[PDB]
From Swiss-Prot, chain A:
Full protein name: Acetolactate synthase isozyme 3 small subunit
Subunit composition and interactions: Dimer of large and small chains.
UniProt similarity note: Belongs to the acetolactate synthase small subunit family.
Gene that encodes the chain: ilvH
Its EC number(s): 2.2.1.6
Length: 163, 158
């Protein structure tokens, strides 16, 4: 009931609208989406995380191919793949809590990118589950003031290449 | 030039489609877009990076405040802020180029997350400029085969 689609799309104004518009017209759900330029045959690459019925989630890919700005579409889960997200989290802590936040940041291989006497801003990259586990490890020991999270970026492993 | 908006919105489309529609109907360049779930199962946070078009963006933003599915809107480029991105880059990595890719990954403090005897996939997080510099340093030396970049996310400084 969860699918991850990679899309290679021409950078033109309107292209992102047409893709999102296609989902808006079925209630194809968008759990997360990332899109940004590649090293640029003027193309961008999009990663879309969708959740719902396997039936409608399979109508998706055929319809994406109809869009003139869409160059390639690949369902990442049908082969070996990697998925990552980045998160920034501002955390207020004192005493033992500051200790725990620092320790957990080390454990999760994050880094602190801003520091005041009462606040840390932590940058963490990993799978969604890794980021969720970081939040869970500190939520009841320190105060989470704000979270900014990217949503999933994905690529196939090895010589499976969307070109 | 460069503007970054963060938007909190009720998560379905129509909602996402309505926000992005405000940009496309003006033919306004979107360079990157990220959208992810928040604490609240009903709310998403979107971050959009655009190159404009000065005051046209101002008209888009007041228009954003008028949208029923939008809860809050912020310009990141009003801090005093931190902005970061992540990229996955798959690179043809043979002979001299394999040495070079490994060395440059070390230099930029990335990490290799997939290996074959002729390919590396590098994970790199940093500012947008850091990622750009990594690609510039390698693109003429080893063949970049795939790039998946997140788009920027950000927070104010404390
Ligand atoms: Mg074209
Ligand atoms: Mg120590
Ligand atoms: Mg040597
Ligand atoms: Mg050597
Ligand atoms: Mg060495
Ligand atoms: Mg060249």
């Amino acid at each position: 009931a969860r699918r991850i689609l990679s899309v290679l799309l021409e950078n033109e104004s309107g292209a992102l609208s047409r893709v999102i518009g296609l989902f808006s017209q079925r209630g194809y759900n968008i759990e997360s989406l990332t899109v940004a330029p590649t090293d640029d045959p003027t193309l961008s690459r999009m990663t879309i995380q969708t959740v719902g019925d396997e039936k409608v989630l399979e109508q998706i890919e055929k319809q994406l191919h109809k869009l003139v700005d869409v160059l390639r579409v690949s369902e990442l889960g049908q082969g070996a793949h990697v998925e990552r997200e980045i998160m920034l989290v501002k955390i207020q802590a004192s005493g033992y809590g500051r200790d725990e936040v620092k320790r957990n940041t080390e454990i999760f291989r994050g880094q602190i990118i801003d520091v005041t006497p009462s606040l840390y801003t932590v940058q963490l990259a990993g799978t969604s589950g890794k980021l969720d586990a970081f939040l869970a490890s500190i939520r009841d020991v320190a105060k989470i003031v704000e979270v900014a999270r990217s949503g999933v970026v994905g690529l196939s492993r090895g010589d499976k290449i969307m070109r």
